[PDB]
Amino acid sequence: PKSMQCKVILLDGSEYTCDVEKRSRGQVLFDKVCEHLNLLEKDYFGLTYRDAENQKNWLDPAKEIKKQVRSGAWHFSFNVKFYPPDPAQLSEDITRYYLCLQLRDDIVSGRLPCSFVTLALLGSYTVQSELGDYDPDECGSDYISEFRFAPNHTKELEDKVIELHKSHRGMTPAEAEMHFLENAKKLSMYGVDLHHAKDSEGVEIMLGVCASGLLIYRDRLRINRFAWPKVLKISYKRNNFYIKIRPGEFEQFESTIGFKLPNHRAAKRLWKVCVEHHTFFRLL
Numbered sequence: 001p002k003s004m005q006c007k008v009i010l011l012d013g014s015e016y017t018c019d020v021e022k023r024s025r026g027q028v029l030f031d032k033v034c035e036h037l038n039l040l041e042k043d044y045f046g047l048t049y050r051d052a053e054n055q056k057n058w059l060d061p062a063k064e065i066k067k068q069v070r071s072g073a074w075h076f077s078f079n080v081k082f083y084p085p086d087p088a089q090l091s092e093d094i095t096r097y098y099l100c101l102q103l104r105d106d107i108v109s110g111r112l113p114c115s116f117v118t119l120a121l122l123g124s125y126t127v128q129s130e131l132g133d134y135d136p137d138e139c140g141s142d143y144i145s146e147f148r149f150a151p152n153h154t155k156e157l158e159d160k161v162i163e164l165h166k167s168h169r170g171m172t173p174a175e176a177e178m179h180f181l182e183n184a185k186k187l188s189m190y191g192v193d194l195h196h197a198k199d200s201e202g203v204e205i206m207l208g209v210c211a212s213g214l215l216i217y218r219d220r221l222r223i224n225r226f227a228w229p230k231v232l233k234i235s236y237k238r239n240n241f242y243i244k245i246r247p248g249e250f251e252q253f254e255s256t257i258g259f260k261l262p263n264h265r266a267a268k269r270l271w272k273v274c275v276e277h278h279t280f281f282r283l284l
């Protein structure tokens with residue numbers, strides 16, 4: 001039996017290495033990673049890889065790894081796939097912990113935009129979780145944390161993190177992580193997967209996929225939202241992505257909204273994340 005080496009970037013930035021038989025399906029590698037992480041609530045998570053166009057793709061657990069990575073390295077990242085709308089209802093603290101690590105990267109990366117005060121507040125809960133109670137011994141008037149809190153750091157942000165950290169004395173790691181999540185879950189881009197597209201007129205838009213449904217970001221003024229129950233059919237053909245929008249009470253016909261994606265693979269990728277979100281969030 002021939003085995004391929006797999007490298008997985010974990011959410012703390014460390015690398016997990018293992019071997020799987022070369023015809024293994026994605027579920028095999030994912031089960032190895034989740035066992036390493038002591039993770040039981042695995043349904044919210046997945047592995048991504050980069051394709052030959054350098055696009056992030058979800059590794060499909062049902063399909064052979066080799067038929068997905070194709071010509072690329074067997075290099076993966078461990079990620080949140082389905083962001084829980086109510087992290088308080090997850091059964092395990094360790095689930096909440098990995099969700100916090102993902103969100104910290106969503107924030108530092110700029111995928112999850114955040115006000116100054118919310119960057120500082122989230123930062124303060126991370127520090128409380130990671131270091132425990134505030135200690136002035138480690139932190140003088142010139143303190144800069146090793147923790148990344150934002151896409152751009154300022155001394156004012158570091159100071160506000162410390163001020164709010166002082167307020168969390170006695171807070172345990174699980175408690176700080178729950179506070180982090182109660183705040184992060186409210187952010188307008190929480191758990192929103194953005195795809196670049198053009199509308200039927202050629203105007204550049206972003207399509208957001210999340211728990212609540214499909215979002216169309218046009219220009220600051222005019223954001224369309226289609227709740228999953230309002231979506232009967234998701235389709236792709238060539239470079240085009242289509243959603244079937246329910247008639248609404250006393251209308252005779254379903255209505256159709258069409259988008260142009262950069263290429264056929266981008267349209268298929270958007271279709272698959274929409275179908276997976278619709279299934280997941282129709283059962284939640």
Ligand SMILES: CC(C)Nc1cccnc1
Nearest residue numbers: 048056057058194195269
């Ligand atoms: C399917 C996910 C992992 N990758 C992605 C998300 C948004 C836009 N393009 C690619």
